[PDB]
Amino acid sequence: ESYHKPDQQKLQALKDTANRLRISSIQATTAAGSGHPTSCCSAAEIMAVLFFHTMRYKSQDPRNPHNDRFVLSKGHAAPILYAVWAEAGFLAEAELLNLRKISSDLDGHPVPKQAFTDVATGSLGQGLGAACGMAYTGKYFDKASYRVYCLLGDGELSEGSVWEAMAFASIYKLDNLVAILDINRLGQSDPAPLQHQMDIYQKRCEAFGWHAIIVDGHSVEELCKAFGQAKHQPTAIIAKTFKGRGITGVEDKESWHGKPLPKNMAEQIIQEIYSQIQSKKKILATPPQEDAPSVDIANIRMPSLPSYKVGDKIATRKAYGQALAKLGHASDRIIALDGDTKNSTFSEIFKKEHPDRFIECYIAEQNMVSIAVGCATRNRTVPFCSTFAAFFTRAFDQIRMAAISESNINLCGSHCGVSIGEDGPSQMALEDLAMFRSVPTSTVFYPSDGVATEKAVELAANTKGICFIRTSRPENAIIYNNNEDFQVGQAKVVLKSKDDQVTVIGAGVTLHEALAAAELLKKEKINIRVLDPFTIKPLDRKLILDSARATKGRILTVEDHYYEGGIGEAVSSAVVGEPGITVTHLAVNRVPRSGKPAELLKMFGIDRDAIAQAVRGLIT
Amino acid sequence: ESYHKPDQQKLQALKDTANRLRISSIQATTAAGSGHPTSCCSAAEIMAVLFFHTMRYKSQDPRNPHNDRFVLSKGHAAPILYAVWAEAGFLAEAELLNLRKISSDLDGHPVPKQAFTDVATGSLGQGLGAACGMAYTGKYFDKASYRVYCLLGDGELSEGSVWEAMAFASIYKLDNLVAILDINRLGQSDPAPLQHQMDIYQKRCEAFGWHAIIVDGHSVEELCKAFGQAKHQPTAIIAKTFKGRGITGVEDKESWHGKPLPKNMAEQIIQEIYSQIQSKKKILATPPQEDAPSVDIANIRMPSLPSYKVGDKIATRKAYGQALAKLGHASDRIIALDGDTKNSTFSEIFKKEHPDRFIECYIAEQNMVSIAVGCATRNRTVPFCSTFAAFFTRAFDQIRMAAISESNINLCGSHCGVSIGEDGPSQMALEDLAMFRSVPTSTVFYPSDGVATEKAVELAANTKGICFIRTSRPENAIIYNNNEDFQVGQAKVVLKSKDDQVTVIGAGVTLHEALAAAELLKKEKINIRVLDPFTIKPLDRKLILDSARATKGRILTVEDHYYEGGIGEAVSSAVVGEPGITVTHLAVNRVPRSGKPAELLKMFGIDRDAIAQAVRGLIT
Numbered sequence A, B: 001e002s003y004h005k006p007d008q009q010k011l012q013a014l015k016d017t018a019n020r021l022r023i024s025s026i027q028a029t030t031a032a033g034s035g036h037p038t039s040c041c042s043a044a045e046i047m048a049v050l051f052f053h054t055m056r057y058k059s060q061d062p063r064n065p066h067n068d069r070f071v072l073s074k075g076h077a078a079p080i081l082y083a084v085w086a087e088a089g090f091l092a093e094a095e096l097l098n099l100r101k102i103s104s105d106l107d108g109h110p111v112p113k114q115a116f117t118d119v120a121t122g123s124l125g126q127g128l129g130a131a132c133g134m135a136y137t138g139k140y141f142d143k144a145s146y147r148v149y150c151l152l153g154d155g156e157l158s159e160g161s162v163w164e165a166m167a168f169a170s171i172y173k174l175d176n177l178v179a180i181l182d183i184n185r186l187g188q189s190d191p192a193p194l195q196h197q198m199d200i201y202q203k204r205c206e207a208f209g210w211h212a213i214i215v216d217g218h219s220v221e222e223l224c225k226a227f228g229q230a231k232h233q234p235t236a237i238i239a240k241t242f243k244g245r246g247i248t249g250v251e252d253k254e255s256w257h258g259k260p261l262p263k264n265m266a267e268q269i270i271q272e273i274y275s276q277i278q279s280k281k282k283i284l285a286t287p288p289q290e291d292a293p294s295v296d297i298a299n300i301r302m303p304s305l306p307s308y309k310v311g312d313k314i315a316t317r318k319a320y321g322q323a324l325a326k327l328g329h330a331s332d333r334i335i336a337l338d339g340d341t342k343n344s345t346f347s348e349i350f351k352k353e354h355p356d357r358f359i360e361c362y363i364a365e366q367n368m369v370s371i372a373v374g375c376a377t378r379n380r381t382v383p384f385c386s387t388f389a390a391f392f393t394r395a396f397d398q399i400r401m402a403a404i405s406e407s408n409i410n411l412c413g414s415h416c417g418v419s420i421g422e423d424g425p426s427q428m429a430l431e432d433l434a435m436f437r438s439v440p441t442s443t444v445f446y447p448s449d450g451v452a453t454e455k456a457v458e459l460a461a462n463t464k465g466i467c468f469i470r471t472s473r474p475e476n477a478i479i480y481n482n483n484e485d486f487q488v489g490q491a492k493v494v495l496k497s498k499d500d501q502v503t504v505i506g507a508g509v510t511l512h513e514a515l516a517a518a519e520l521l522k523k524e525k526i527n528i529r530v531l532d533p534f535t536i537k538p539l540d541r542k543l544i545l546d547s548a549r550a551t552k553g554r555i556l557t558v559e560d561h562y563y564e565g566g567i568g569e570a571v572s573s574a575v576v577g578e579p580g581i582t583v584t585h586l587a588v589n590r591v592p593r594s595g596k597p598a599e600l601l602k603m604f605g606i607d608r609d610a611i612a613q614a615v616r617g618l619i620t
């Protein structure tokens, strides 16, 4: 636990290691013909000191739950990440030369198919948020001794998501977290705004609550000392470096970002760098203290059935909070995150019952998603984050990268559609189905009553990938019995007869408007089938087609969402070309406006009267 | 012009005005049954001083180009915005009571159907970026004397987009910009992280380069004085306020965000506030100096036809930069913005030729979009912002709000799809068609060669709404004659014969793969029709169906995009139910990986061999 103050031999070995890391970064990117060697070279001493002096980890078990965590937020320096894991003996040295090949897993940016990578990076400014999740988990959930280190670029610090993470770490006193800023003066296409004004970086980090240390980022001794001292708050090591450090004629120059060295130049430069290496002997990693606890990864089952009764009124946003609090008694791994909307999403119910597992993320949706991704790494927790569904559009790049990170997180977005009424369109989610359907690992739950909501929470907890649950503001009636069985990809026919003339597909508020339309139409001797998809992705194609073939081939979809990328388009894409099938589509055709929920459902053509009129037009 | 130091009577009139604004905010939200009176009341002295001492504007012409700008970033305080414009005499006082009604345009959050609103707010943290665009336009494009004032909440300051804007304003020395921070201690569901630690707010603003003044936010005199001194930096007025100020029993209390007062309570409170008002006499607005220049509104035309030659190879990303620079020579209204990717998007070509109209936005996509929106307000410029298409997912909420703002901005996203090759999925746009198609005011151009790209740039410049141009990395052949006419919503058949067996729809790289598949299939005596959509939204439904009817009803769509929300789903939704029509869909089915462009097109089943295989299977 004491700092091991290095002797001159250890320091020289760390210098030798940094220069081996430079050589490998050049060799690999020259072999591939693409990549970012100058972005690797500015970080070589940082990487050497982190992996061969400061960090504690099992070199043959990178995912080990007791290990210190390292997050390469500037993911385009991937070649030097691969180099340190070869230096540590986990990766074969020859495999480094296969960088970016389709036959290799040493891809252009780090990805979790690599045992030594927890989260994919490559979209800049997201790594510190994931690191914050890891550090929060280590400090407050695992209560373990591992530390979390996150390496960022200086151009990267222009992303606002970075400063959300900065503020989060000081709010939650993440003294097990270290951010290393590679201040190499240059971005991709020009100098970074602050260049080498190290004092301004220090002032910005200190103002956001971090202990900020300016170092020479090419001095292994200064780095050892800065990493070695006792942290009392999150610590920023602000490293003055030169891009392309060690590449004569390229160091500190523009026009070299993302440019590999040609073969002839690489050979010449590598010879120069090799001439600076005093010994070929490698430093061994040091293993960690093994005090992370065991976690139960068994299937998660609710402690009881839903306790609703058919006919009761409840909004699915309220049923979400009730179900999430219940799920917290079913599993110690459930955590909840919310962005200052807990009284609107009803995640406050979970907070009241399991306060130690609720994370207030404040008005910072991008960081909230990144925190959840970090908390889910190494399967330590099962996160549920919530806000208005409209404000998950603020975090789309984090959600996109979460799928590239093969992350298992759960997202519940409330206040979907025009049915929220008077707040108007800034608060109305009308594109969230399009957004989440386009996320490749996603399961999109759209529960239509309190029972389906509780069942969706339970299923989501046990489902891999990006799970989205779309909840609603109107109080609608319970239509399912408490022992109704639900499955991902299985729809429900909630009204049927042998004389059905259309299959009407609705969800949430428009399922209840479709049931109301069915009652109106029965007064004119017109029966319609009503189908509740339950999951919009994956869609129950078979039940939709079987239903349509029983209703003259006619499908009518109605949704509180824009036309593009929603339920209607999913249904059309599923059935196109099937003989005799037709699909009519009712949705929201433009930016809405303020009014009462029923007034807006009418104005935008997705209420019971619009459904009934569409049905009549189909019959004639 | 000299500061007019107000006498005690002017100060009392400002207090009277602030209290009238309180009363109206309460009356309107109690009448509506919803809204945020406590969020209005903390800002009442700020609003009174801004509109009736500091700002200069035409009270009867809120959109006038010489006016100072006000941006209500904390948009849920809309009732007090409406109240000031009634106090200034633009809005009928009686209409305030119709807040949030479907019969009114005084909607729950501000929207540009209101003459006094430039940008919609309601999604927190976006107003300051729009204000930065307005102030940049005022200082460097209009070169006018108007100033820009932006009111933010304190919970709102947790959004990273705010700090991107803070940094932008100090980089570009926006000394015509003032941010007012309503530090009323409380957010929606808890105190804001910093509560009333005014010194930490000051340190954060100063560290980001702003002149920061702490004031008593309920002192009209301190506010007059703080607003009355211009600076050489953007200026942050950090106002210590109490939420619900002036509402006895509610001031400084939790559990009141977004809660209207019940009628009995509102009547009692209003009588208390009215007893503090010394005179009914209203202050008059003071008009501005009229030095904003005229701006032309005419159609913008390229100075000449494209000058490519059929058979030449150019990537559409390079054609974009060439076309944008060319268009810059025809109209001085064109401005370009980029997020440190100008050497990759080729917006660097525009920077080289028109440096005064290029805005480097650094690695901050959310702010870049907001800057563009701000620059486009009052039609002052025609902005084109660019980055990798994948990183526009970082700005989806800003793009969403831009459509609610009825903004005319142009966005070009490069590096779409797996065809970028070795960088891997973090850089691959595979959901951008889904995202932009879901934006209700959007036109989505997907040019397949350099000619189409230049035509798309010209069309986009003259098209209202959110225009997206998807560009690509591969260097594909010019296929169109320079004099080919292009229109929004009109596709092109680029290969046909009388014996065509399938209509293959591709775009960008998959159009060229389709053309290569056609050559492979001709060896097998199989002709295919090949169709280039040009715009994905709106889709040329008629040409698609006419083509399909000439090819035995068979359509095959192939796209470098995920399955959901892209070209295939757009086509399927357009043609579903049409007799005899079938649609086969080839797209990317999961998160990709690194490899050569051609290897990834093959791996993910969208190359010439996958297309030919699908055609051979259809014909059987």
Ligand SMILES: CC1=C(CCOP(=O)(O)OP(=O)(O)O)S/C(=C(/O)CO)N1Cc1cnc(C)nc1N
Residues within 6 Å of the ligand: A038, A039, A042, A074, A075, A076, A122, A123, A124, A125, A152, A153, A154, A155, A156, A157, A182, A184, A186, A187, A188, A192, A243, A257, B339, B340, B341, B363, B387, B391, B394, B427
């Ligand atoms: C602009 C940019 C880079 C420059 C980073 O400069 P830096 O100072 O943070 O790091 P180094 O100087 O250490 O290189 S790396 C890069 C890529 O596309 C490659 O991922 N991009 C485009 C990019 C833009 N926006 C986002 C969100 N992610 C990105 N990866």
Ligand SMILES: CC1=C(CCOP(=O)(O)OP(=O)(O)O)S/C(=C(/O)CO)N1Cc1cnc(C)nc1N
Residues within 6 Å of the ligand: A339, A340, A341, A363, A391, A394, A427, B036, B038, B039, B042, B074, B075, B076, B122, B123, B124, B125, B152, B153, B154, B155, B156, B157, B182, B184, B186, B187, B188, B192, B243, B257
């Ligand atoms: C959390 C939140 C508000 C609290 C604002 O606190 P503040 O301190 O900035 O302002 P005041 O204290 O001055 O009210 S107003 C609000 C709404 O949905 C209403 O638009 N929301 C949800 C919200 C969440 N995220 C975003 C991006 N926008 C939002 N509007």
Ligand SMILES: O=C[C@H](O)CO
Residues within 6 Å of the ligand: A343, A344, A473
């Ligand atoms: O009351 C409902 C509001 O929409 C959020 O609490």
Ligand SMILES: O=C[C@H](O)CO
Residues within 6 Å of the ligand: A258, B343, B344, B473
């Ligand atoms: O060509 C290399 C990168 O893709 C951008 O220029």
Ligand SMILES: [Ca+2]
Residues within 6 Å of the ligand: A153, A154, A155, A182, A183, A184, A185, A186, A187, A192, A243
């Ligand atoms: Ca840099």
Ligand SMILES: [Ca+2]
Residues within 6 Å of the ligand: B153, B154, B155, B182, B183, B184, B185, B186, B187, B192
């Ligand atoms: Ca506040």
